[PDB]
């Protein structure tokens, strides 16, 4: 679970709205990173989150594919674009309810990318994914 009064992200989460996902994918092209979309693109599976303070595991499972990512809020980690360019990523708490991941390619030029996850007071989980001026929002509720 979470620290103190901060909300508990642990759960099984069902998507009930999306906007601008295909648009984001087109702007990103080969700059998209699987360590983001491999637990977000597919709408059918539950997104299974396990939170232990700052430590997160995020898992999806279909009969074809199981994927799990992990990170710790506050600890830098590396992810890859689909064409193999490394990115340094860091998640921080932006607010009581919201984490923000900043991302930077290790070398060369690309779009400014980020994502956020927010557990709003109505009980929804909001994922936003950004590439320069394009913002994708996906809204989840508990299964």
């Amino acid at each position: 679970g979470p620290l103190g009064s901060m909300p508990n992200f642990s759960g099984n989460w069902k998507i009930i709205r999306s906007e601008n996902f295909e648009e984001l994918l087109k702007v990103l092209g080969v700059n998209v990173m699987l360590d983001d979309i491999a637990v977000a693109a597919a709408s059918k599976p539950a997104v299974e989150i396990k939170q232990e303070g700052d430590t997160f595991y995020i898992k999806t499972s279909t009969t074809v594919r199981t994927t799990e990512i992990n990170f710790k809020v506050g600890e830098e980690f590396e992810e890859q674009t689909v064409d193999g360019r490394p990115c340094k990523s860091l998640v921080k708490w932006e607010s009581e309810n919201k984490m923000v991941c900043e991302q930077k390619l290790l070398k060369g030029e690309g779009p400014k990318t980020s994502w956020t996850r927010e557990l709003t007071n109505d009980g929804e989980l909001i994922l936003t994914m950004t590439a320069d001026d394009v913002v994708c929002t996906r809204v989840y509720v508990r299964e």
Side-chain angles (χ1 to χ4, degrees):
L3 184 67
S5 302
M6 297 172 79
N8 191 354
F9 284 77
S10 298
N12 300 311
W13 297 97
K14 181 177 199 291
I15 191 166
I16 57 71
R17 198 180 188 277
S18 185
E19 67 182 26
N20 293 341
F21 188 56
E22 179 183 349
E23 186 180 84
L24 176 77
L25 293 172
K26 292 182 163 186
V27 170
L28 285 170
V30 298
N31 302 319
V32 69
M33 301 187 285
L34 294 172
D35 288 349
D36 302 338
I37 63 161
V39 295
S43 306
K44 172 167 188 73
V47 177
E48 313 170 37
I49 300 179
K50 292 192 57 168
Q51 174 178 14
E52 294 297 352
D54 285 343
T55 301
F56 279 74
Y57 283 71
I58 306 185
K59 179 176 173 181
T60 58
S61 188
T62 71
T63 57
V64 178
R65 180 167 58 97
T66 295
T67 307
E68 186 161 64
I69 67 164
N70 73 275
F71 58 86
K72 188 177 179 167
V73 182
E75 288 197 359
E76 182 245 293
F77 63 102
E78 195 168 287
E79 52 193 320
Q80 187 128 44
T81 67
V82 285
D83 71 336
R85 291 169 292 132
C87 181
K88 172 180 56 163
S89 296
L90 176 64
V91 185
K92 296 175 68 178
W93 298 117
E94 179 178 319
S95 77
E96 174 174 15
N97 301 337
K98 185 172 180 186
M99 67 180 74
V100 54
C101 186
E102 295 301 339
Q103 299 179 320
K104 187 159 194 166
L105 280 169
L106 288 192
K107 35 73 189 204
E109 198 281 313
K112 193 182 179 167
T113 68
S114 62
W115 62 255
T116 70
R117 283 182 168 90
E118 182 177 13
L119 212 168
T120 52
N121 293 334
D122 64 9
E124 297 169 3
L125 171 66
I126 309 189
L127 169 64
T128 79
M129 296 178 284
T130 303
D132 294 324
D133 199 35
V134 170
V135 182
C136 165
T137 304
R138 282 181 163 202
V139 184
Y140 303 81
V141 292
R142 292 182 180 279
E143 292 277 0

